Amino acid sequence: EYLLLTPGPLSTSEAVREAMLKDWCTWDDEYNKDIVEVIRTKLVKLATKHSGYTSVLMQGSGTASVEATIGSAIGKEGKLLVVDNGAYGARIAQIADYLNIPCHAVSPGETSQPHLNEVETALASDPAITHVAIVHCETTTGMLNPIEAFASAAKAHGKVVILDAMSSFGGIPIDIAELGIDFMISSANKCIQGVPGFGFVIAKKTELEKCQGQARSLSLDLYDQWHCMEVNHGKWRFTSPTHTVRAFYQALLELEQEGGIEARHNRYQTNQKTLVAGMRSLGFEPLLSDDLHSPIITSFYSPTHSDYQFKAFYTRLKEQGFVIYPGKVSNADCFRIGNIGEVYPADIERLIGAIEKAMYWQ
């Protein structure tokens, strides 16, 4: 009915939703081997060309998979270093606080890319740090963080690297082995284009094996979940959201049929650049400078006009068949427009015309 221009849950294809029409037995080999183990194999190949990697699927929101990683990888005597330049980086610090894990937040500001100066200074002054965490795309602003330079500084200091690639994996090309990522966390419902219900972790097999007996949660026990899936060939310890897992298997086939991540990245990149160009022609201004823009979601400043109201602008756009998203920027009045899911160049063009008609304050 509406095109969801959100960061996810988003507009999924008909086949992705149609795949949810069958019921599955959680104990049957058709589910565990022919569905789950296929997902697991495909996910590892999508994340790297290299050996030594493995995948774990975890029920719940994507945050639950981020908490599974933090609470399972970090030992009793470990300390976390986080790059917090948005709500998601802050959420990694909040997880650490709940789990009583010593944490050092390196806050570079929401509208600027992390100065690796602060990072290298934290890594040199604080030898107690065992793990470092960074958000690939800060979905709050749509900022693309420099994960390569960051993970390299961490590997140089002999620290474990955790990447929150929730809004980037499947839509931005990355080889986690080459970049030196130890744990890469991502979603079923963002760039891969499945539906929500679970998340996953693609990890270096040697680093995942170290998580055994270190977990702070039974449900979020990364090793125990991984080990059950390994020895029982796809078996989830507790009930898996079967329908959403089948929808994800379909979303993977549609990613292969598009031409993979490189092809999806190009479609996203074109959508985002056409969107920014069209929005600028209508007088809107992006929150970040173009060099910091990700091809996933763009933050735009709310019009300074006294008659402007997000809810009113949002409602007028919904009437035209487009669902935009509110801004999450702490020290800025903003709104966001995602360009992921069933969003194609023709849609972005139809949207720019719809933005124009929804500009009631003109």
Please report the sign of the dihedral spanned by the C-alpha atoms of residue 46, residue 52, residue 53, residue 56.
Answer: positive
Contact residues for 290 (Cβ-Cβ < 8 A; gap 6+) = 276
User: Whole-number minimum distance, CB 160 to a copy of itself, in Å?
Assistant: 20
**Cβ 239 vs Cβ 228: under 8 Å:** no
User: Whole-number minimum distance, CB 124 to a copy of itself, in Å?
Assistant: 30
Which residue's structure tokens are 């991502």?
186
Alpha carbon of residue 358 to chain centroid: 30
User: Whole-number minimum distance, CB 232 to a copy of itself, in Å?
Assistant: 12
The reply to whether 269 sits near a copy of itself by the rule CB under 8 A is: no
Which CB, 64 or 116, lies closer to a copy of itself?
64
The reply to whether 136 sits near a copy of itself by the rule CB under 8 A is: no
For residues 324-353, which are near a copy of itself according to CB under 8 A?
325-326
Which of 219, 270, 274, 320 is close enough to bind a copy of itself by CB under 8 A? 219
From the number of C-beta atoms within 10 Å of its C-beta (0-12, 13-18, 19+), residue 319 rates as exposed
C-alpha–C-alpha distance, residues 88 and 175, integer Å = 22
Question: Which part of the chain contacts a copy of itself (CB under 8 A), choosing from 55-63, 137-145, 177-185, 260-268?
Answer: 55-63
Which of 155, 227, 243, 350 is close enough to bind a copy of itself by CB under 8 A? 243
Question: Which part of the chain contacts a copy of itself (CB under 8 A), choosing from 169-177, 243-251, 271-279, 289-297?
Answer: 243-251
Q: Which of 333, 327, 329, 297 is nearest to 86 (CA)?
A: 329
User: Whole-number minimum distance, CB 176 to a copy of itself, in Å?
Assistant: 23
**Cβ 287 vs Cβ 300: under 8 Å:** yes
DSSP class of 302: P
Which of 32, 48, 54, 63 is close enough to bind a copy of itself by CB under 8 A? 63
The reply to whether 24 sits near a copy of itself by the rule CB under 8 A is: yes
The reply to whether 67 sits near a copy of itself by the rule CB under 8 A is: yes
Which CB, 98 or 360, lies closer to a copy of itself?
98
Which of 138, 182, 221, 347 is close enough to bind a copy of itself by CB under 8 A? 221
The SS3 assignment for 206 reads helix
Which residue's structure tokens are 């809004």?
167
Which of 55, 139, 186, 189 is close enough to bind a copy of itself by CB under 8 A? 189
Which of 22, 77, 291, 346 is close enough to bind a copy of itself by CB under 8 A? 22
C-alpha–C-alpha distance, residues 144 and 136, integer Å = 6
Question: Which tokens hold the place of 260?
Answer: 């993979």
What is the residue-wise DSSP string for 329-345? -TTS-EEEEE--SS--H
The reply to whether 241 sits near a copy of itself by the rule CB under 8 A is: yes
**Cβ 111 vs Cβ 286: under 8 Å:** no
User: Whole-number minimum distance, CB 66 to a copy of itself, in Å?
Assistant: 9
The reply to whether 59 sits near a copy of itself by the rule CB under 8 A is: yes
DSSP element (H, E) containing 258 = helix 242-258
C-alpha–C-alpha distance, residues 168 and 158, integer Å = 25
Which of 69, 244, 271, 298 is close enough to bind a copy of itself by CB under 8 A? 244
In the complex, the residues that contact a copy of itself under the rule CB under 8 A are: 1-2, 4, 6, 8-12, 17-18, 20-28, 59-64, 67, 71, 91, 94-95, 98-99, 187, 189, 195-197, 215-221, 236, 238-244, 247, 323, 325-326
